Write a protein that binds this DNA or RNA. Structure first.
Ligand SMILES: [Mg+2]
Ligand SMILES: [Mg+2]
Ligand SMILES: [Mg+2]
Ligand SMILES: [Mg+2]
Ligand SMILES: [Mg+2]
Ligand SMILES: [Mg+2]
Ligand SMILES: [Mg+2]
Ligand SMILES: [Mg+2]
Length: 121
RNA sequence: CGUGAGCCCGGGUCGAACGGCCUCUAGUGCAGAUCUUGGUGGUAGUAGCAAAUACUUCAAUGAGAACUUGAAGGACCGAAG
């Protein structure tokens, strides 16, 4: 599986956290752009957090590829996993939650016949 | 996984509903407003519990007695009490 691709180079493997999200408990860790008039992060002072922008974008050839080389497709049926019959070299099944224990077995059983990778077997 | 808002999965709890996609709709996104309501801290076992002179012994009750009771002693209000 995972036919062939250029090496998956990630320009930044960390992520962006909100300014002062570590000091205050009311401030979530999800990124929000600092819009204050005196904010040091927004003014890009040396030694502060970085802001998300294009330029950190991933290569288009490897944009949504997991490290194996597949792209994740959410599957919740035996009929849904059969959509990847022709794309088993580029897409990998990912059994969503809410799928009962019995239906999970059938999806694993069928995706094995199709030689489709399952990311949460 | 995505530059990002976010999305997805595994593990634990739980017990009755829920989601994707295309359109339509809105009381639709919070860190502040000496914001509103509710809850909780440090301070902190901290400030303090110091006016009106004052209590002590024995016994009983009782799981437990300085401020319950009886007896004895010592005091105060001192009749515009
Ligand atoms: Mg019920
Ligand atoms: Mg509103
Ligand atoms: Mg809110
Ligand atoms: Mg708030
Ligand atoms: Mg306030
Ligand atoms: Mg004290
Ligand atoms: Mg005092
Ligand atoms: Mg008189």
């Amino acid at each position: 599986a995972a036919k062939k691709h250029v090496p998956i180079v990630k320009k930044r493997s960390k992520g962006f956290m909100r300014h002062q999200s570590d000091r205050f408990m009311r401030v979530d860790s999800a990124w929000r752009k600092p819009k204050g008039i005196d904010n040091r992060v927004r003014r890009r002072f040396r030694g502060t957090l970085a802001m998300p922008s294009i330029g950190y974008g991933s290569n288009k050839k490897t944009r949504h590829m997991m490290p194996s080389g597949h792209k994740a497709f959410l599957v919740s049926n035996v009929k849904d996993v059969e959509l990847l019959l022709m794309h088993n070299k580029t897409y990998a099944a990912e059994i969503a939650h809410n799928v009962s224990s019995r239906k999970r077995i059938e999806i694993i059983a069928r995706a094995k016949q199709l030689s489709v990778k399952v990311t949460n077997a």
